Amino acid sequence: DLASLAIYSFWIFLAGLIYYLQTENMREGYPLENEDGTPAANQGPFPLPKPKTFILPHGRGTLTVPGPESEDRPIALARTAVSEGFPHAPTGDPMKDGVGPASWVARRDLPELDGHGHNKIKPMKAAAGFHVSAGKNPIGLPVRGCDLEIAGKVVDIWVDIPEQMARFLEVELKDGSTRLLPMQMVKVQSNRVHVNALSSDLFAGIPTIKSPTEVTLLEEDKICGYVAGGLMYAAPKRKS
Amino acid sequence: AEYQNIFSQVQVRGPADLGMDEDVNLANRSGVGPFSTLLGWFGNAQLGPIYLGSLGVLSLFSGLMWFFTIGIWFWYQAGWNPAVFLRDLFFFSLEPPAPEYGLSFAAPLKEGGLWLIASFFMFVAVWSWWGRTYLRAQALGMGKHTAWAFLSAIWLWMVLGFIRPILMGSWSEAVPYGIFSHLDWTNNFSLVHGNLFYNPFHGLSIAFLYGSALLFAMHGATILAVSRFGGERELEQIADRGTAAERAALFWRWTMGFNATMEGIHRWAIWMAVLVTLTGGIGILLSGTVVDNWYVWGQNHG
Amino acid sequence: ALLSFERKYRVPGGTLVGGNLFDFWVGPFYVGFFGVATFFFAALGIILIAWSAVLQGTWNPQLISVYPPALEYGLGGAPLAKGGLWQIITICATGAFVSWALREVEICRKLGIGYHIPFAFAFAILAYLTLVLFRPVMMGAWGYAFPYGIWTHLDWVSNTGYTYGNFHYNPAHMIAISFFFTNALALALHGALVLSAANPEKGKEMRTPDHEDTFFRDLVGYSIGTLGIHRLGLLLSLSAVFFSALCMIITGTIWFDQWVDWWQWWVKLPWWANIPGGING
Ligand code: BCL
Ligand code: BCL
Ligand code: BCL
Ligand code: BCL
Ligand SMILES: CC[C@H]1c2cc3[nH]c4c(c3C)C(=O)[C@H](C(=O)OC)c4c3nc(cc4[nH]c(cc(n2)[C@@H]1C)c(C(C)=O)c4C)[C@@H](C)[C@@H]3CCC(=O)OC/C=C(\C)CCC[C@H](C)CCC[C@H](C)CCCC(C)C
Ligand SMILES: CC[C@H]1c2cc3[nH]c4c(c3C)C(=O)[C@H](C(=O)OC)c4c3nc(cc4[nH]c(cc(n2)[C@@H]1C)c(C(C)=O)c4C)[C@@H](C)[C@@H]3CCC(=O)OC/C=C(\C)CCC[C@H](C)CCC[C@H](C)CCCC(C)C
Ligand SMILES: COC(C)(C)C/C=C/C(C)=C/C=C/C(C)=C/C=C/C(C)=C\C=C\C=C(C)\C=C\C=C(/C)CC/C=C(\C)CCC=C(C)C
Ligand SMILES: [Fe+3]
C-alpha cells in the first residue's frame, strides 16, 4: 500500500542523503594519514568527493577542495611511544613553536576584505565614525596578567567595520611597542582589563604584525593561537 | 572567571550601513532605522533599512487583511465588549464551513464563509512572501537556499489547510483560526486516526525536531568555543581554513570519531531542519486519505 | 587514522584525572580516565538490559522493555525482576552521561577551546534526570519514571500526558514548544544563509557576510549577525529543553488537576469575571 511504499522510499532516500552529506564533509582533512604523514591504509567506506571550485571575490583567485593538503610549516614534535595513539611531545617551547593549544595555521598573509574590497578590521583611530557606544571603554585602561602583574595599556580598539564589532585590543608594552589581544580572551573590568591566558612576562612573546594599520589572516591565527595556548602553558605562573 | 561571549563587553558603533547593491533596485529600500543598544548586547544594533517593493507590499497588505478578518469575527463573539474580548481571547475562533458545504464557497459568512475569506488572504500573503525571499536572493546574486528551505515549511502548511481538505472532500477538515481552538484540532486529529505515535512519519518528524535542537545546540556552542580564533567568520574559514576550523573539527573527531567541515555542517544543518516539515507533511497527507487508523496500519502495514 | 592537520594538536596534557595514564587515543577517539569510565557504565548497562531481556522472554528490540518499580515500592529499592534492574540501569545511564560530559571537558583543555559544548549537553542530562529522578523522588515513587523501551516509552508519554487531559494546556509546555519550533526555523535559515553565500548563482563569486546582512535587512528589516545567530541558536535550544524540564517538574507536584482548568484564574478575574457574553458566560 501507499504509506508502506512512501516509507521505504524515504529510508532509501535518507541513506543517499547521508552518503552525500558525509562525502561533502570530506573536502578538508582527507585523505587520512599515519602519524608519520604517509597515506593511511584504510580510509573508510565513503570515497572522496569530486573537486569543487570557489571563486574568491576581489581578484583573490580560486580555491579547489578537496586538494593537496600541506601544513606548510615545521612541527616541533617528537613521538613518545613506539606505537600509534600516543601524545607527541613539544621538542621546544610549545608557545614559541606553535604546537598543541597554541597551534596556528598557515593561512594567506593578506587581510580579510569586506564586501567592497576594503580591510574588514581597522584600528578604531582609522575608522571614521566609529566610537564606543555602550559598556565601559577599554582604551586607556592598564592590562593585568594571570600573575596579577601589569603588563601594558590599551591604546586602541581594533574594530570590524561591516559587523560593527570590537575584535582586538591594541596593547602598549613596557618598551612602547604594541601587541594585539583577542577581544574574546579578555575581561574588561571597571578599572582594568584582566587577561587570564597569559602571565605578564608572556605579552612581549605575542606575535607582532608588519603593518600598524592592518592584520593579515595568518597573523590573526598566530596571535590567537599563542594567546589560547597560554591557558595550558602559562598555568605555572597563573594564580588565584 | 573567563569571558564566555554570550553578550558583548563593549559596543562599538559606526555610520549606518546601507548595504551591498548588486542588482538590487535601491529605489525600493527604505531609510535606516534607529539603533537598539539592547539588541547590541546580543547581536547587531542597526535596524533597517528594509526593502519593500511591489510583492513586498502585496504580502504585507494581504497579510494584515487575514489578521483583521479573524479579529473582526473575534469582536463579534466578544459582543464588541472589550473586557470580554480580552477575557476570552484564547477562546474565540473562526471555524471553517460545516461538512455540508463540502468544497464549495457557497457557505454563508457566519458559517465558514468568513473563514474562507481569511484563508484566501493568508494564501496570498504567504506565496507572495515566498517569491519575495526568492527574488531578494537573485538581486544579491546568492543561491536560492532560503527559498527552497522555506518551501519545506510551506509544504506542511499547504497540506494542513488545503491539500488534505480537498482530497478529503471538504474545507471542514482544515484547521480553525484560534489559540486554544487549534490546539484541540491537533489533539483530536490524533485520536481520530488511531493515535499518531503509530504514524511512522510523525515519529520521523519528531526525530528531526529533536535533532534540530541537538545540532544547533552543538553547532552554536562549537562556534562560540572557537570564537577566540575568530570562528564565527564562517565564509572566510571556508575559503581559507584556520585553527578555528581545525580545533572545531578535532573536538568532535575525538569525541565521536566522526566530524564535519566548516561548510558541510551547514548542509547538515539545513537538511536536519528542513526534514521536520518534509516528513510531517507526508505523515499528515496520508492520514484520512490512505491510512484511516495508524494503530491498525501498524498491525498489518497493508 | 589521522587528519592531514591533526598531529600538531595531539600534545600531552589537559586531563582532569590520572595524569597521563589514559592520555592517548584509539583510532580517532580520545580516551582519558572518563573514556574508560563511560565504557564501563555502558558495557555493564547493556549487559543488564540483555539480562532483563531473558527474564521477559524476548530478544526483540520492538518489545524489550525495562519497567521501573511499582508505586508500591515507593522510593525504596525493588527486586531485580520487579523494578530493581531499571534502578541499577538508571544509575549506569546517569554514570555514562556524566562521564561523557566530563570527557569532553578534557578534550576541551587539550584543544584550548571554550567549554560551551559540554555545558549545553549538561542541559540534556538535566532533562533526563528530571524525568527519572527529580520528578519521581518528589512524587515518592520510582514508579512515575518512564520505561526503557522503544514503544513502551511512547505509551508512557501518552498516558502521563492524558492524565491531566490535553497536555497542550500546560503553560510551560506551550513556551517549550515555541522555543523548539523557533529553533528549527532559526537552524533552517542559518544553514540556508551561509550556503547561499558560499554557493552563489553559477559563475558568480563567493558572496560575503556583508551580502548576508544585506539579504536579511532587505527581507525582514533586521540582521542578528554572524556571531549573534550562533548565540541565538545556543540560546533557543537550551531554552527549549529548560522549559521542557520545567513543564514536567511542576506537573504532578504543584499541580495535579486538569491542565485546561488551570486557565480559569485568567477568566475568573473580577473585572470581567461576571460580564455577560463571550465564550465564558
Ligand atoms: C522527550 C520526551 C520523551 C520521549 C518522547 C519521544 C517521542 C514522542 C518520540 C521519541 C522517539 C525516539 N526517542 Mg524518545 N523520549 C524520551 C526520552 C528518550 C531517551 C532518554 C535516554 O531519556 C532516549 C535514548 C530516547 C530515544 C528515542 C529514539 C529511539 C527515537 C527518536 C529518534 C531521534 O531522532 O532522537 C533525537 C536524537 C538524534 C537525532 C540523535 C541520534 C540518537 C539515536 C537515534 C539514539 C538511538 C538510541 C537507541 C534506540 C537506544 C540505544 C540504547 C542501547 C543500550 C545503546 N528517548 C522522553 C521520555 N521519543 C521517536 C520515535 O520514533 O519513537 C518510536 C518519537 O516519535
Ligand atoms: C495530542 C496530539 C498528538 C500530536 C498530533 C500532531 C498533529 C495532528 C501534527 C503534529 C505534528 C508534529 N508533532 Mg505532534 N502530536 C503529539 C505529540 C508530539 C510529541 C510528544 C513528545 O508527545 C512531539 C515531539 C511531537 C512533535 C511534532 C512535530 C515533529 C510536528 C510539527 C513540526 C513543526 O515544526 O510544525 C510547525 C510548522 C508549521 C505549521 C509550518 C507551516 C508554517 C507556515 C508556513 C507559516 C505561517 C506563518 C504565519 C502566517 C505567520 C506570519 C508572520 C507574523 C509575524 C506572525 N508531537 C500528540 C500525540 N502532531 C504536525 C506534523 O507534521 O505531523 C506529522 C501535525 O500536523
Ligand atoms: C504542528 C501541529 C499543530 C500546532 C500545534 C501547536 C502546539 C502544540 C502549540 C502551538 C503553539 C503555537 N502555534 Mg501552532 N500548530 C499548528 C499550526 C499553526 C499555524 C499555521 C499552521 O499555518 C500557526 C501560525 C501556528 C501558530 C502557533 C503560535 C501561535 C503558537 C507558537 C509560538 C511559536 O513557536 O511560534 C514560532 C513562530 C515565530 C517565533 C514567529 C511568529 C510569531 C507568533 C505568531 C506569535 C504568537 C503569539 C501569541 C498569540 C501571543 C501570546 C501572548 C499573549 C500576551 C498571551 N500554529 C499545527 C496545526 N501550536 C504553542 C502555544 O503556546 O499555543 C497556545 C503550543 O504549545
Ligand atoms: C499525548 C501526550 C501530550 C504530551 C505529553 C508530553 C509529556 C508527558 C512530556 C512531553 C515532553 C515534551 N513535549 Mg509533549 N505532549 C503532547 C504534544 C506535543 C506537541 C504537539 C505539536 O502536539 C509538541 C511540539 C510537544 C513537545 C514536547 C517537547 C517540548 C518536550 C520533549 C522534549 C524534551 O524534553 O527533550 C529533553 C531531552 C531529553 C529528555 C533527552 C535526554 C538525552 C540524554 C541526556 C542522552 C541520551 C543518550 C543516548 C542514550 C545515547 C545513545 C548513543 C548511541 C551511540 C546512539 N508535545 C501531547 C498533548 N510531552 C516531555 C518533557 O517536557 O520532558 C522534560 C515530557 O515529559
Ligand atoms: C523547517 C521548517 C521550519 C521553518 C522554516 C522557515 N520559515 C520561514 C523561512 C523558513 C526556511 C523563511 O524564509 C520565512 C522568513 O521570512 O523567515 C525570516 C519563514 C517564515 N516562517 C514564519 C512563521 C513560522 N514558521 C514556523 C515554522 C517553521 N519554519 C519550521 C520549524 C512557524 C510555526 C512553528 O508555527 C511559524 C509561525 C513566518 C514569520 C515567516 C514568513 C512570513 C510570511 O509569510 O509573511 C506574510 C506576511 C504577513 C502574514 C504579515 C502580517 C503579520 C501579522 C498577522 C500582523 C502583525 C505583523 C505586521 C508586520 C505588523 C505591521 C504593522 C504596520 C504598522 C507596519
Ligand atoms: C539539551 C539541549 C539539546 C542537546 C544537546 C546535546 N546533546 C549532546 C551534546 C549536546 C550539546 C553532546 O555533546 C553529545 C554528543 O556527543 O553529540 C554528538 C550529545 C548527545 N545527545 C545524544 C542523544 C540525545 N540528545 C537529545 C537532545 C538534546 N541534546 C537537546 C535537544 C535526545 C532526545 C531529544 O531524545 C537524544 C536521544 C547522544 C547521541 C549524545 C551523547 C552520547 C553519550 O553520552 O554517550 C555515552 C553514553 C552511552 C553510549 C550510554 C548508554 C547508557 C546506558 C547504560 C544504556 C541505555 C540506557 C537508556 C536509558 C536506554 C533508553 C532507551 C530508549 C528506547 C528509551
Ligand atoms: C485589536 O484587534 C485588531 C483589530 C487589531 C485585530 C485583532 C486580530 C486578532 C486578535 C487576530 C488573532 C488571530 C490568531 C490568534 C490566528 C491564529 C491561527 C492559527 C493558530 C493557526 C492557523 C492554522 C491554519 C493553517 C493550517 C492554514 C492554512 C491555509 C491554507 C493552506 C490556505 C487555504 C486556502 C483556501 C481556503 C483557498 C482560497 C481560495 C482560492 C480560489 C485559491
Ligand atoms: Fe554557522
- CATH code, domain carrying C250: 1.20.85.10
- 3-state helix/strand/coil string of chain A: CHHHHHHHHHHHHHHHHHHHHHHHCCCCCCCCECCCCCECCCCCCCCCCCCEEEECCCCCCEEEECCCCCCCCCCCEEECCCCCCCCEEECCCHHHHCCHHHCCCCCCCCCCECCCCCECEEEHHHCCCCEEEECCCCCCCEEECCCCCEEEEEEEEEEECCCCEEEEEEEEECCCCEEEEEHHHCEEECCEEECCCCCHHHHHHCCCCCCCCCCCHHHHHHHHHHHHHHHHHCCCCCCC
Beta bridge partners of A182: A168
Asked whether the beta carbons of B261 and C271 are under 8 A apart, the reply is no
Asked whether the beta carbons of B38 and A154 are under 8 A apart, the reply is no
For residue A131, the distance in angstroms to the closest alpha carbon of chain B comes to: 5
Asked whether the beta carbons of B242 and A98 are under 8 A apart, the reply is no
State the maximum Cα–Cα separation within chain A, in Å, rounded to a whole number: 81
Helix C228-249 × helix B200-225 angle, to 10°: 130
Residue A192 sits at φ, ψ, to 5 deg, of -175, 160
Asked whether the beta carbons of C243 and C176 are under 8 A apart, the reply is yes
Which distant-in-sequence residues (6+ apart) come within 8 Å of A199 by Cβ? A145, A146, A147, A149, A230, A234, A237, A238
Provide the b/e sequence for B239-262 (b: ≥16 CB within 10 Å): bbbbbbbbbbbbbbbbbeeebbbb
- Give the DSSP H/E element, type plus range, for residue C25: strand C25-26
d(CA B229, CA A97): 17
Q: Residue C205 has what DSSP assignment?
A: P
d(CA B223, CA B251): 11
Q: Residue C165 has what DSSP assignment?
A: B
Verify whether the Cβ–Cβ distance C211 to A55 is below 8 Å: no
Asked whether the beta carbons of C278 and B88 are under 8 A apart, the reply is yes
Q: Is C272 on the interface with B (CB under 8 A)?
A: yes
The domain total for chain C is 2
Verify whether the Cβ–Cβ distance A25 to B260 is below 8 Å: yes
d(CA C230, CA C69): 43
Instruction: Using the atom order of ligand 6, give the atom closest to the CA of residue C119.
Output: 11
Experimental method: X-ray
Domain boundary among C124, C146, C163: C163
What residues does each domain of chain A span? 2-106, 107-237
Asked whether the beta carbons of C232 and C224 are under 8 A apart, the reply is yes
d(CA A102, CA B198): 52
Which distant-in-sequence residues (6+ apart) come within 8 Å of A137 by Cβ? B10
Give the resolution in Å. Answer: 3.0
Asked whether the beta carbons of B262 and A19 are under 8 A apart, the reply is no
Are C83 and C119 in a shared domain? yes
Look up residue C143 and give its three cell numbers.
514508579
Asked whether the beta carbons of B238 and B262 are under 8 A apart, the reply is yes
Instruction: For residue A205, count CB atoms less than 10 angstroms from its CB and return exposed for 0-12, middle for 13-18, buried for 19 or more.
Output: middle
Look up residue C53 and give its three cell numbers.
531481556
d(CA C245, CA B198): 25
Task: Using CA coordinates, name the residue in chain B closest to C122.
Answer: B217
Of residues B204, B239, B267, nearest to A21 (C-beta)? B267
Asked whether the beta carbons of C239 and B60 are under 8 A apart, the reply is no
In chain B the domains, ranked by start, together with CATH numbers, are 18-143 (1.20.85.10), 144-301 (1.20.85.10)
Are C131 and C153 in a shared domain? yes
Are C200 and C155 in a shared domain? no
What residues in B contact C39, CB-CB < 8 Å?
A: none
Look up residue B191 and give its three cell numbers.
485520536
- Give the DSSP H/E element, type plus range, for residue C126: helix C116-129
Are C181 and C143 in a shared domain? no
- Give the DSSP H/E element, type plus range, for residue C248: helix C228-249
Residue with cell 552543538: B218
Distances (CA, A) of B4 to A171, B7, B221: 21, 8, 10
Look up residue C6 and give its three cell numbers.
591533526
Q: Is C26 helix (H, G, I), strand (E, B) or coil?
A: strand
d(CA C173, CA C240): 10
Provide the b/e sequence for C101-132 (b: ≥16 CB within 10 Å): bbbbbbbbbbbbbbbbbbbbbbbbbeeebbbb
C280 domain residue, yes or no: no
C230 domain residue, yes or no: yes
Q: Which ligand lies nearest the alpha carbon of C44?
A: 6
Of B13, B3, B74, B68, which is closest to residue B40 (Cα–Cα)?
A: B13
Q: Which CATH number fits domain A2-106: 1.10.760.10, 4.10.540.10, 3.40.1190.10, 1.20.200.10?
A: 4.10.540.10
Q: Residue C167 has what DSSP assignment?
A: G
Residue with cell 574594530: A159
Residue with cell 602571565: A199
Of A215, A169, A175, A211, which is closest to residue A188 (Cα–Cα)?
A: A169
- 3-state helix/strand/coil string of chain B: CCCCCCCCCCEEECCCCCCCCCCCCHHHECCCCCECHHHHHHCCCECCCCECHHHHHHHHHHHHHHHHHHHHHHHHHCCCCHHHHHHCCCCCCECCCCHHHCCCCCCCHHHCHHHHHHHHHHHHHHHHHHHHHHHHHHHHCCCCHHHHHHHHHHHHHHHHHHHHHHHHCCHHHCCCECHHHHHHHHHHHHHHCCCHHHCHHHHHHHHHHHHHHHHHHHHHHHHHHCHHHCCCCHHHHHHCCCHHHHHHHHHHHHHHCCCCCCCHHHHHHHHHHHHHHHHHHHHHHCECCCECCHHHHHHHCC
Which distant-in-sequence residues (6+ apart) come within 8 Å of A22 by Cβ? A46
Asked whether the beta carbons of A7 and B201 are under 8 A apart, the reply is yes
Instruction: For residue A61, count CB atoms less than 10 angstroms from its CB and return exposed for 0-12, middle for 13-18, buried for 19 or more.
Output: exposed
**Quick one: A107-237 is in which CATH superfamily?**
Photosynthetic Reaction Center, subunit H, domain 2 (3.90.50.10)
Instruction: Using the atom order of ligand 5, give the atom closest to the CA of residue B156.
Output: 2
Are C148 and C258 in a shared domain? no
C269 domain residue, yes or no: no
Residue C127 sits at φ, ψ, to 5 deg, of -65, -40
Are C20 and C73 in a shared domain? yes
Provide the 10 A C-beta neighbour count for residue A82: 6
CA angle B106, B107, B112 (to 5 degrees): 135
C276 domain residue, yes or no: no
Asked whether the beta carbons of A168 and A182 are under 8 A apart, the reply is yes
Nearest CA to ligand 5 atom 2: B153
Asked whether the beta carbons of C132 and C126 are under 8 A apart, the reply is no
Are C59 and C125 in a shared domain? yes
Of A103, A95, A87, A75, which is closest to residue A235 (Cα–Cα)?
A: A95
Are C199 and C99 in a shared domain? no
Instruction: Using the atom order of ligand 7, give the atom closest to the CA of residue B75.
Output: 2
C173 domain residue, yes or no: yes
C116 domain residue, yes or no: yes
Residue C239 sits at φ, ψ, to 5 deg, of -65, -45
What is the Cα B174 distance to its own chain's centre? 19
Are C55 and C105 in a shared domain? yes
Whole-number Å distance, alpha carbon B232 to ligand 8 midpoint, is: 7
Residue with cell 557606544: A133
d(CA B164, CA B151): 17
Pocket of ligand 2 (CB under 6 A): B 122, 126, 153-154, 156-157, 186-187, 189-190, 196-197, 201-202, 205-206, 209, 276-277, 280, 283-284; C 157, 181, 184
Look up residue B17 and give its three cell numbers.
550601513
- Does ligand 6 lie within 6 Å of residue C150's CB atom? yes
Between positions 28 and 67 of A, the ones with CB within 8 A of C are: 29-35, 37, 40, 54-57
Are C91 and C214 in a shared domain? no
Determine the length of chain B. 302
- Tell me which residue range forms the domain holding C134: 1-163
C258 domain residue, yes or no: yes
Are C253 and C207 in a shared domain? yes
Of residues A4, A6, A21, nearest to B271 (C-beta)? A21
- Helix, strand, coil % over all residues of chain C, rounded to 5: 60, 5, 35
Domain boundary among C163, C186, C220: C163
Are C87 and C169 in a shared domain? no
d(CA A157, CA C147): 56
C6 domain residue, yes or no: yes
For residue C78, the distance in angstroms to the closest alpha carbon of chain B comes to: 31
Torsion of CA B177, B181, B186, B187, to 10 degrees: -170
Q: Which ligand lies nearest the alpha carbon of B178?
A: 7
Residue with cell 464551513: B97
Look up residue C202 and give its three cell numbers.
553559477
